[PDB]
Amino acid sequence: EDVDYEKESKRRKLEDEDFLKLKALEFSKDIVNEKLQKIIVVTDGMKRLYEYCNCKNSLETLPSAANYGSLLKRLNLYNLDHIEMNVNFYELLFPLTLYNDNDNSDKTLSHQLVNYIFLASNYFQNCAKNFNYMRETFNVFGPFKQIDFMVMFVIKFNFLCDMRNFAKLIDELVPNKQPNMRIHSVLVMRDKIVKLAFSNLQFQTFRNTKHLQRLIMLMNANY
């Protein structure tokens, strides 16, 4: 017999060495980000919606969209109020921060990421700046009960096409298990001012969904 615990104490002593190795394995990069996987899945993951998005250059309004706006009139059948009027912004863009630029990179990418972030920020700032103008320029095609939601969708979709392109530039570079602290915080504060812009909007609002429902969920940060 050996009733004393010291046997198990020694066993713990042994185990302890592993601790650091285990933790390091628990902090190494991760192979892929399922959020980006979901993006790639949904991108043209529903009937032919890619082909309408001829819009480009990330800084454009009513780029001959009226052709697509006709099909948005047809979409007007749906209760487009299911669309969120707010932009999830950070709550979608978080996965992009899971990249230590010191590795799997020339350390150059984060710069372009911040540039794209400020781009989209100014985009949405102009959207808030001119929404009513945009309302009228598309109301040209006829008022609709949910024209506000239609405009919101137009904005979000046109953004999303560029977002798809931008993501496919990175093309599933290996992410870290955790985001960059400073990039995350910068995103956080810029999202603060962005939601402040939504507050400054001060507007008020004016099933066979499953396909378009996929993109609606994705806009609404379904997970």
Partner: protein, 364 residues
């Protein structure tokens, strides 16, 4: 205060990382398992490391920064068994509890946690780390743990900082975490800190209280700790007056060097005497002017001990009130004076001479 009934504390330095494994779904009597779970953390930053996927046992998991309310403040917190609750390294008392016994897993015993059901699962880390100060360096952010993960594996020369607003509690917490991970590290890396540090010596005193608190239930580790300024400068002067082969030489070096010789002379080194002398508190203690803390020093198999004041017999109050007293027929003022006159005459010395007869404790 005290911990409310039906709450338990588990200390583990390992809890510096979130122990995703251990927790199990609580259930009420009647096996009413509560897969709804909510967790509370010092900061939103803490959430960024913590993964929902680790807990298939639960269908519903949520996490929030703690905030110290007012209206619920009670010795007995509010109860809500409808959800399991966890607090991880909490700073401040909690006013609400989950299903069944609530449990907290934390590195650090706050005073709030004293009168509490507590377990530690402790283990000794043998490797004491060190500070160093030169006035190459690794700039370590003063708060974020894993920002420099594996850098703390690779290097040994760690610079530290803080932002002005920082809660002292947060400072202590981060420092504790760093020291634990260092004690796990295989070599004594060197601290460097860019702060006025007087408040850091204050916080060190806090750490002393904390370690004692632990030791109330603890592993009695031989944990290294030091006075950091008075001592520091003194030892620096000591080295300077000696030859300085290494201005970076650790104190423990000199300590052990004297250890080599103490027993053969059976008497107390002045270095160790000045230690436990010029600490504010753990010493002769200018905090309260307490030289009364004389050291009784013992060694294996001895029939006797070495006091601050000479040999003593074992387990007795340092000096007998009775003795072969210093009978005044010696130490007669008159005799002392005469001798002094003789001496001064011979020396041709005008000033600066004083003498005192010796005195004796238990033994002569």
């Amino acid at each position: 205060m005290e911990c409310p009934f039906q709450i338990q504390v588990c200390i583990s330095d390992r809890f510096f990382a979130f122990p995703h494994n251990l927790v199990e779904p609580q259930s009420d009597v009647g096996n009413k398992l509560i897969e709804n779970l909510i967790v509370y953390v010092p900061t939103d930053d803490d959430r960024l490391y913590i993964d929902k996927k680790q807990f298939p046992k639960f269908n519903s998991v949520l996490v929030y920064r703690h905030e110290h309310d007012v209206n619920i403040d009670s010795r007995s917190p509010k109860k809500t068994a409808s959800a399991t609750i966890v607090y991880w390294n909490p700073l401040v008392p909690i006013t609400e509890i989950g299903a069944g016994e609530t449990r907290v897993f934390s590195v650090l015993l706050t005073n709030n946690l004293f009168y509490c059901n507590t377990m530690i699962v402790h283990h000794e880390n043998p490797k004491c780390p060190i500070e160093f100060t030169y006035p190459n360096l690794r700039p370590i952010a003063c708060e974020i743990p894993l920002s420099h993960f594996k850098e703390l594996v690779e290097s040994n020369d760690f610079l530290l900082c803080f932002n002005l607003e920082t809660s002292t509690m947060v400072k202590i917490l981060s420092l504790k975490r760093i020291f634990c991970i260092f004690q796990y590290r295989k070599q004594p890396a060197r601290y460097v800190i860019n702060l006025p540090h007087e408040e850091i010596d204050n916080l060190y005193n806090k750490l002393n209280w904390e370690r004692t608190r632990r030791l109330m239930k603890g592993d009695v580790p031989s944990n290294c700790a030091t006075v950091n300024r008075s001592s520091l400068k003194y030892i620096k002067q000591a080295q300077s007056l000696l030859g300085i082969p290494d201005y970076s030489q650790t104190v423990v070096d000199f300590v052990k060097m004297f250890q080599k010789i103490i027993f053969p002379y059976q008497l107390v080194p002045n270095v160790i005497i000045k230690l436990n002398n010029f600490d504010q508190m753990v010493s002769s203690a200018p905090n309260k002017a307490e030289p009364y803390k004389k050291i009784r020093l013992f060694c294996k198999n001895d029939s006797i001990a070495i006091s601050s004041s000479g040999i003593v017999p074992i387990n007795m109050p340092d000096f007998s009130p009775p003795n072969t007293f210093d009978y005044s027929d010696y130490a007669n003022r008159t005799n002392i004076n005469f001798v002094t006159q003789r001496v001064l005459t011979d020396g041709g010395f005008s000033s600066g001479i004083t003498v005192t007869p010796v005195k004796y404790n238990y033994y002569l």
